Short mmCIF file of C-alpha atoms (C1' of nucleotides) in Angstrom, two decimals:
data_model
loop_
_atom_site.label_atom_id
_atom_site.label_comp_id
_atom_site.label_asym_id
_atom_site.label_seq_id
_atom_site.Cartn_x
_atom_site.Cartn_y
_atom_site.Cartn_z
CA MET S 297 -52.26 -9.04 -4.78
CA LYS S 298 -50.58 -12.14 -6.98
CA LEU S 299 -46.99 -13.60 -5.46
CA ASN S 300 -45.14 -14.57 -8.90
CA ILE S 301 -42.66 -16.57 -7.14
CA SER S 302 -40.20 -18.53 -9.15
CA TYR S 303 -37.53 -21.38 -7.12
CA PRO S 304 -34.64 -20.81 -9.67
CA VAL S 305 -32.48 -24.08 -7.99
CA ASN S 306 -35.27 -26.10 -9.71
CA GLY S 307 -35.81 -23.88 -12.27
CA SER S 308 -40.01 -23.35 -11.99
CA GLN S 309 -41.78 -20.60 -10.84
CA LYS S 310 -45.66 -20.09 -10.38
CA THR S 311 -47.99 -17.61 -9.05
CA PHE S 312 -50.41 -17.31 -6.06
CA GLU S 313 -53.20 -15.04 -5.73
CA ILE S 314 -52.82 -13.85 -1.88
CA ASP S 315 -56.77 -11.67 -0.92
CA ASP S 316 -56.42 -11.45 2.58
CA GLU S 317 -54.47 -8.39 3.59
CA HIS S 318 -52.77 -10.13 6.35
CA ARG S 319 -50.55 -11.65 4.76
CA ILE S 320 -49.80 -8.69 2.09
CA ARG S 321 -49.00 -5.98 4.92
CA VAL S 322 -45.66 -8.06 5.33
CA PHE S 323 -44.55 -6.97 2.16
CA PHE S 324 -45.27 -3.09 2.42
CA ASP S 325 -42.68 -0.71 2.57
CA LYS S 326 -39.89 -3.84 1.40
CA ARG S 327 -38.22 -2.90 -1.19
CA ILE S 328 -36.49 -4.66 -4.33
CA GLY S 329 -33.65 -6.94 -3.09
CA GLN S 330 -34.74 -7.20 0.61
CA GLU S 331 -35.10 -10.43 2.82
CA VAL S 332 -38.83 -11.43 3.64
CA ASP S 333 -40.04 -14.41 5.74
CA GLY S 334 -43.58 -15.69 4.37
CA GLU S 335 -43.73 -17.91 7.68
CA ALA S 336 -46.19 -14.46 9.10
CA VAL S 337 -47.60 -14.05 5.66
CA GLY S 338 -48.79 -17.86 5.57
CA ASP S 339 -48.22 -21.33 7.49
CA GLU S 340 -47.30 -23.42 4.79
CA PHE S 341 -44.71 -20.71 4.07
CA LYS S 342 -42.48 -22.00 7.05
CA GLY S 343 -39.16 -21.46 6.77
CA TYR S 344 -39.38 -20.22 3.73
CA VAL S 345 -36.50 -16.32 3.20
CA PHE S 346 -37.49 -14.51 0.03
CA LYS S 347 -35.97 -11.50 -2.04
CA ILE S 348 -38.53 -9.44 -3.83
CA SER S 349 -37.45 -9.22 -6.99
CA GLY S 350 -39.53 -7.25 -9.67
CA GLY S 351 -43.49 -6.59 -10.97
CA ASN S 352 -45.71 -4.42 -11.94
CA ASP S 353 -48.84 -2.36 -10.91
CA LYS S 354 -52.25 -2.06 -11.62
CA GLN S 355 -51.20 -0.15 -14.93
CA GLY S 356 -48.51 -1.86 -16.18
CA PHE S 357 -45.81 0.18 -15.43
CA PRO S 358 -43.13 -1.82 -13.62
CA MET S 359 -40.89 -1.25 -10.24
CA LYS S 360 -37.08 -0.10 -11.50
CA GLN S 361 -34.42 -1.09 -9.18
CA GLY S 362 -34.06 1.33 -6.30
CA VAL S 363 -34.87 4.44 -8.29
CA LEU S 364 -37.03 5.67 -5.07
CA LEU S 365 -41.04 6.83 -4.03
CA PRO S 366 -43.72 4.59 -4.31
CA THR S 367 -46.14 6.75 -6.07
CA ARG S 368 -45.49 6.68 -9.82
CA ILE S 369 -42.68 9.31 -11.44
CA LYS S 370 -41.95 10.04 -15.35
CA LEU S 371 -37.86 9.40 -16.07
CA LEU S 372 -36.01 10.12 -19.20
CA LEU S 373 -35.62 6.24 -20.51
CA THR S 374 -33.75 4.74 -22.69
CA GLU S 375 -31.42 7.91 -28.36
CA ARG S 376 -33.78 8.35 -24.81
CA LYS S 377 -37.19 9.03 -24.75
CA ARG S 378 -39.56 9.65 -21.89
CA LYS S 379 -41.97 7.39 -20.02
CA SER S 380 -43.48 6.70 -16.51
CA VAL S 381 -42.01 4.75 -14.45
CA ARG S 382 -43.33 3.38 -10.91
CA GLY S 383 -41.08 3.24 -7.95
CA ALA S 384 -38.97 0.50 -6.42
CA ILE S 385 -41.06 0.39 -2.88
CA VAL S 386 -44.32 -1.96 -2.65
CA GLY S 387 -47.33 -0.29 -2.09
CA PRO S 388 -50.97 -1.51 -2.09
CA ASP S 389 -51.52 -0.45 -5.95
CA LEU S 390 -49.77 -3.46 -6.92
CA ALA S 391 -51.01 -5.90 -9.23
CA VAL S 392 -48.87 -8.29 -8.47
CA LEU S 393 -45.06 -8.72 -6.48
CA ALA S 394 -42.93 -11.00 -8.24
CA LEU S 395 -40.12 -12.38 -6.01
CA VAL S 396 -37.57 -15.53 -5.83
CA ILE S 397 -37.14 -18.07 -2.93
CA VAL S 398 -33.48 -17.79 -0.92
CA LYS S 399 -33.70 -20.46 1.89
CA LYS S 400 -35.82 -23.02 2.20
CA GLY S 401 -37.87 -24.24 5.25
CA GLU S 402 -39.58 -27.02 6.68
CA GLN S 403 -43.37 -27.61 3.79
CA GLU S 404 -43.59 -27.76 0.19
CA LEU S 405 -45.32 -26.42 -2.43
CA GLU S 406 -46.55 -29.01 -4.97
CA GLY S 407 -46.41 -27.03 -8.59
CA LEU S 408 -42.97 -24.80 -6.78
CA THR S 409 -40.79 -27.41 -4.83
"C1'" U C 410 -42.41 -1.99 -32.18
"C1'" C C 411 -45.56 -1.29 -23.26
"C1'" U C 412 -43.47 -4.28 -19.44
"C1'" A C 413 -41.83 -7.90 -15.06
"C1'" G C 414 -38.42 -11.39 -12.63
"C1'" A C 415 -35.80 -16.87 -13.70
"C1'" G C 416 -32.92 -21.03 -16.34
"C1'" C C 417 -30.29 -21.57 -20.94
"C1'" U C 418 -26.13 -21.53 -25.07
"C1'" A C 419 14.57 -11.84 -27.26
"C1'" A C 420 14.31 -13.11 -32.14
"C1'" A C 421 15.02 -10.34 -36.83
"C1'" A C 422 16.91 -8.26 -41.35
"C1'" U C 423 18.85 -4.30 -43.92
"C1'" C C 424 22.22 -0.33 -44.17
"C1'" U C 425 27.89 1.02 -44.36
"C1'" C C 426 33.19 0.14 -43.28
"C1'" G C 427 36.19 -4.09 -44.43
"C1'" A C 428 40.85 -8.19 -42.50
"C1'" C C 429 41.46 -10.35 -46.37
"C1'" C C 430 41.63 -13.64 -51.06
"C1'" C C 431 41.44 -14.07 -56.01
"C1'" U C 432 41.39 -13.02 -61.10
"C1'" U C 433 36.50 -15.37 -62.50
"C1'" U C 434 30.49 -15.41 -62.16
"C1'" G C 435 33.89 -12.09 -58.66
"C1'" G C 436 33.10 -12.83 -51.81
"C1'" A C 437 33.33 -12.27 -47.65
"C1'" A C 438 35.02 -12.63 -41.50
"C1'" G C 439 33.74 -9.23 -37.91
"C1'" A C 440 33.26 -3.00 -36.72
"C1'" G C 441 28.77 -1.17 -36.29
"C1'" A C 442 24.00 1.64 -37.08
"C1'" U C 443 18.09 1.70 -36.94
"C1'" G C 444 9.62 1.69 -34.17
"C1'" U C 445 4.70 4.24 -36.14
"C1'" A C 446 1.46 7.83 -35.21
"C1'" U C 447 0.20 11.96 -31.45
"C1'" U C 448 2.15 16.34 -29.17
"C1'" U C 449 5.30 20.55 -27.54
"C1'" A C 450 10.35 22.31 -27.58
"C1'" U C 451 15.24 21.58 -30.14
"C1'" U C 452 18.67 20.36 -35.19
"C1'" A C 453 19.94 19.70 -40.74
"C1'" G C 454 16.68 21.40 -45.04
"C1'" A C 455 32.33 27.01 -50.51
"C1'" U C 456 34.08 24.53 -55.28
"C1'" C C 457 35.76 21.40 -59.01
"C1'" A C 458 36.80 19.52 -64.45
"C1'" A C 459 39.53 21.96 -69.77
"C1'" U C 460 37.66 22.91 -73.95
"C1'" G C 461 39.41 28.85 -70.32
"C1'" U C 462 44.07 30.52 -69.10
"C1'" C C 463 49.24 30.95 -68.86
"C1'" U C 464 53.69 28.18 -69.29
"C1'" U C 465 60.39 27.01 -68.90
"C1'" C C 466 56.61 22.54 -72.40
"C1'" G C 467 57.30 19.81 -66.55
"C1'" G C 468 52.65 21.93 -65.19
"C1'" A C 469 50.60 26.07 -62.84
"C1'" C C 470 45.58 29.17 -62.81
"C1'" U C 471 39.50 29.12 -61.61
"C1'" C C 472 40.65 36.47 -63.34
"C1'" U C 473 36.66 35.79 -67.99
#
RNA sequence: UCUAGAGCUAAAAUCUCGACCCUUUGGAAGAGAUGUAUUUAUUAGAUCAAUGUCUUCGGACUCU
């Protein structure tokens, strides 16, 4: 999946296509708000600290903050209707995984920092 | 007309009382007294004048 990475200290943001399953496996069953080191994910991510922020799945249904259940469910959403809601928890059926940098480590990213 | 995360833009015045002073347009010291809505309970929401009448011509009487 893709990592929509933003760096708000400079304000810039950039997506990275990640196809290797060893890289994505660190993010599995992790939740929005949790602190994630991508140094296991990648050697260029050495010392980085990431927080999961949001994203979508392969059908557009977003992860909503702290609902539960990493499958998809249907909720009474805001004069209130019902739509389908993909859960808060990262699974392999995510098309993307948007996150945010918390602590910076050693190496640099040209289009990001 | 689906969505994600990021950085921005106390004082008041009026009411009554008036010590008084002053004769004219009269004028005043100080003595006090007063929230709006809402809610329940409590509170308020016999007489006088004569023209009647009597009289002793001074006045008395409210029976009509």
